[PDB]
Amino acid sequence: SEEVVIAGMSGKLPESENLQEFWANLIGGVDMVTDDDRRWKAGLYGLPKRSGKLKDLSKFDASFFGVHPKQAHTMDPQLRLLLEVSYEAIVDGGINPASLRGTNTGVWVGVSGSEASEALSRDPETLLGYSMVGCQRAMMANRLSFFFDFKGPSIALDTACSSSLLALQNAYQAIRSGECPAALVGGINLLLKPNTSVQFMKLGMLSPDGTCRSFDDSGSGYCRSEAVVAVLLTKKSLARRVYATILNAGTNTDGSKEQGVTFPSGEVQEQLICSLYQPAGLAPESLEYIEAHGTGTKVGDPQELNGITRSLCAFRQAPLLIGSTKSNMGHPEPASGLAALTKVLLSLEHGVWAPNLHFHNPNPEIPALLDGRLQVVDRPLPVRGGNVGINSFGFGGSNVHVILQPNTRQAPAPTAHAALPHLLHASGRTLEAVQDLLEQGRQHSQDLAFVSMLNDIAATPTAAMPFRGYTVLGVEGRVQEVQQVSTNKRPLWFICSGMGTQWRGMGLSLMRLDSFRESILRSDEAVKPLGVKVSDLLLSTDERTFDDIVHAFVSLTAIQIALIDLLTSVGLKPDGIIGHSLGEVACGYADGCLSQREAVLAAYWRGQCIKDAHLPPGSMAAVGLSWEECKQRCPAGVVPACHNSEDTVTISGPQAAVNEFVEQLKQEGVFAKEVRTGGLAFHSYFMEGIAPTLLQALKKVIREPRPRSARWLSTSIPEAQWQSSLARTSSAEYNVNNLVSPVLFQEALWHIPEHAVVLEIAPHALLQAVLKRGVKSSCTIIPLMKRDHKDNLEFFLTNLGKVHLTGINVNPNALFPPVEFPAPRGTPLISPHIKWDHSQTWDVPVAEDFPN
Ligand SMILES: *C(=O)CCCCCCC
């Protein structure tokens, strides 16, 4: 009573470096059996020249897997390959391995030989202990468990040829029962030692021509082959990708047989199949296809298919499609079950059955081939729908059978709201690793599930995946960056900018994201009573809307909250918050001191209370002087208002002594420009007369002032005084002090640590230059919006991209409506686009490392 699915798969098979190459060979009808000298001189000892072999055994990203080089040279290639294939298989499922660490996830590996362990133990004087650690069969599973921190069962099992499908049947049982949430299931087989082939030849088990002629009259033995295959199973609840569901699996053993231990009992094979179908409530009628063991043997093939005839065809009207992967690539012995499995799932994902090779004349000892009750797939056929069975048998008598219900979910009808641009992250071991995943994005941008899933696997520790990239999909250009990443952890700082960041139609672009639009609608709910709507102000044809002080104050705050609402939804929590002027209202909200209604109302009243009040005229100017040298050369009346950098400082004072300090300053050609303030001298004693009206209004808005965290640095209160009762809370008192006191901005930037990532939360990034000049060189500075820029959603995505690029983990899936998993059938494979760093080349045992 727990539904088990096949979530993810990867492999290397003969002439197939990954499952895309394997699929190309299958649907292409390319024989993957070869007669070159890769493993040993062809014909040696009178052996068949033909065998299925891997393109390469020498490559292993040793350092990603925490394997030191001395250890990698003395590790069974089986394991080196299975670590890579196992990683491949998990992420293929759209599952971040991190999510399975520390869980009771189990590992089961079919493996029948470590030829390598004999090779590397031959010379006592120069052998290495690490060779025990890298070749002992338990490790073919125990190493997987160790690397992935999987704490369920970790078991290497031998039932000869049925071993890997038995591993499937065990992982299945462990998940059906609740013992395990998930399970990695492996099959491995290599042909390093020729003496092993000689054994099989002399037993009469090998076709001289190296061909599994499955189901054919001339079947006279099998072709030995290599395989490395990994499959992730999960309970349905955890799945994103779902190739198929396991309706049922089981194993029996032939037991006693007159004919001998290695004669395959079709009667007992039949017993096994009969036990799994009607008794479990599954009709043979519901099978479209059976993957037979199909080794192409005088005895095996008739025993097997006559079994299939009596157990399944006997209770069917339609013919049963049958096939065997062994025709295509040979028998990879214990890996047979999982090789056969991948052929079945690739066929289903592509909507076409790959055909057998070598099916010329049917085996006349098999009635159901001659009367068409069993119909060999000898030519690509469309997948018409139905369950799938798979057989795997060992020479000792172990039988396994697995029923699959293929996943047939179609993707949903395209919507108008998804014509939005999307953002794709990727991490990687190499530049090519990232470029390839991002190229798969571009190619399949309309596939919501694929992109969603690629985003999930991008969140990775940076010591392991030192290259990151993003790209924006759904936009005219080629928005993409990729780079090396830091290692050291990178604190995230929010800077909420102040005034001068307003512009006509600001935030209209972002109103397509729902978290943003929903923040603006909440903000509108605060100021409905006070007779204004932020949505309508953003929507204003009218050029001078944000010339009204209340319109600007409520809207800049409203948007700063909406941006903080987006960042929060993609998982970004600030380590430090710094405000500038009006900024300190949003900072409050970021820091969780101000509710959203408090923050938005605070901004309205700060505005309304300045409108209503009669204040001594002053002016404000920006001047190319430092904090200090400005105080020196200042008239009386004129005060340094905003300490921005050591380059820029904003002054305030009376309209006369300012429009005289600009001119006396341009004699010396110095940066000096009076700013539009509607004739108010902010951050000075000219604002003192706002305190009575505003302190009352805010007292009624911020009823129960809440503590400010150590993460929010005041720019309104000097550091010396951060311990005061005023600075304790975002009080009505705090927000009045803000308007009449200087902005101690540079003073606070000093406190931003090394390697920090600094985001300017503002509808235009005014403070970029200032921030750069004010914070340490290490620190990365990132804007979120710019005025009159064609698409601001594209600019936001682009800049979220830049955050992911710093090694800070961002998951953009949350910006758009969630994908409904399981992912639709035919979502593209991820396993083939996981590139490694194969720069190094590792020892492989060779024929002469074994005796003669
Ligand atoms: C399948 O039953 C053939 C025998 C498996 C042993 C392979 C490795 C020694």
Tab-separated table of N, CA, C and O and ligand atoms in Angstrom, residues 112-113 160-161 189 196 200 205 222 224 331 333-334 393-395, ligand 1:
chain	number	residue	atom	x	y	z
A	112	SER	N	27.932	-9.498	-10.686
A	112	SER	CA	28.302	-10.934	-10.701
A	112	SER	C	29.812	-11.125	-10.812
A	112	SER	O	30.243	-12.283	-10.828
A	113	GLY	N	30.607	-10.066	-10.866
A	113	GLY	CA	32.065	-10.250	-10.962
A	113	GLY	C	32.844	-8.982	-10.719
A	113	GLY	O	32.378	-7.919	-11.139
A	160	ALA	N	23.257	-14.219	-10.711
A	160	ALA	CA	23.750	-14.245	-12.102
A	160	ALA	C	22.912	-13.264	-12.933
A	160	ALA	O	22.748	-12.124	-12.489
A	161	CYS	N	22.337	-13.697	-14.053
A	161	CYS	CA	21.774	-12.818	-15.116
A	161	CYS	C	20.542	-12.032	-14.626
A	161	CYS	O	20.295	-10.919	-15.124
A	189	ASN	N	28.365	-4.820	-15.414
A	189	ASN	CA	29.059	-5.973	-16.032
A	189	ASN	C	30.162	-5.453	-16.954
A	189	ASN	O	29.880	-4.548	-17.762
A	196	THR	N	37.203	-15.881	-18.366
A	196	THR	CA	35.765	-15.929	-18.022
A	196	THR	C	34.945	-16.295	-19.262
A	196	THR	O	33.974	-17.046	-19.136
A	200	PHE	N	32.551	-19.818	-20.237
A	200	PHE	CA	31.172	-19.810	-20.801
A	200	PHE	C	31.144	-20.542	-22.147
A	200	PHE	O	30.161	-21.271	-22.421
A	205	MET	N	27.587	-21.983	-23.840
A	205	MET	CA	26.584	-20.908	-23.589
A	205	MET	C	26.725	-19.741	-24.580
A	205	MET	O	25.782	-18.925	-24.619
A	222	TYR	N	24.618	-16.972	-26.602
A	222	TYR	CA	24.520	-15.510	-26.401
A	222	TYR	C	25.858	-14.819	-26.738
A	222	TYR	O	26.931	-15.451	-26.962
A	224	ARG	N	28.277	-12.098	-25.088
A	224	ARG	CA	28.612	-11.411	-23.812
A	224	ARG	C	28.758	-9.908	-24.080
A	224	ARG	O	29.286	-9.544	-25.141
A	331	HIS	N	24.053	-9.721	-24.327
A	331	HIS	CA	23.616	-10.108	-22.977
A	331	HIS	C	24.664	-9.502	-22.064
A	331	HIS	O	25.839	-9.834	-22.181
A	333	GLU	N	24.581	-9.933	-18.970
A	333	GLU	CA	24.606	-10.887	-17.834
A	333	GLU	C	23.782	-10.242	-16.721
A	333	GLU	O	22.608	-9.971	-16.961
A	334	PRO	N	24.325	-9.920	-15.527
A	334	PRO	CA	23.491	-9.453	-14.415
A	334	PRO	C	22.822	-8.086	-14.663
A	334	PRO	O	21.719	-7.825	-14.185
A	393	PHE	N	16.144	-13.980	-16.135
A	393	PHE	CA	16.430	-15.331	-15.599
A	393	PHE	C	17.939	-15.503	-15.459
A	393	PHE	O	18.657	-15.123	-16.397
A	394	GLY	N	18.387	-16.065	-14.329
A	394	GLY	CA	19.770	-16.535	-14.096
A	394	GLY	C	19.941	-18.030	-14.363
A	394	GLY	O	18.932	-18.802	-14.339
A	395	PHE	N	21.183	-18.447	-14.610
A	395	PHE	CA	21.531	-19.840	-14.986
A	395	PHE	C	21.382	-20.748	-13.760
A	395	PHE	O	21.219	-21.940	-13.982
B	1	LIG	C1	23.730	-15.577	-16.608
B	1	LIG	O1	23.072	-16.386	-15.963
B	1	LIG	C2	25.178	-15.889	-16.944
B	1	LIG	C3	26.116	-16.126	-15.772
B	1	LIG	C4	26.452	-14.871	-14.970
B	1	LIG	C5	27.883	-14.761	-14.431
B	1	LIG	C6	28.672	-13.586	-15.010
B	1	LIG	C7	29.924	-13.149	-14.293
B	1	LIG	C8	30.823	-14.262	-13.771
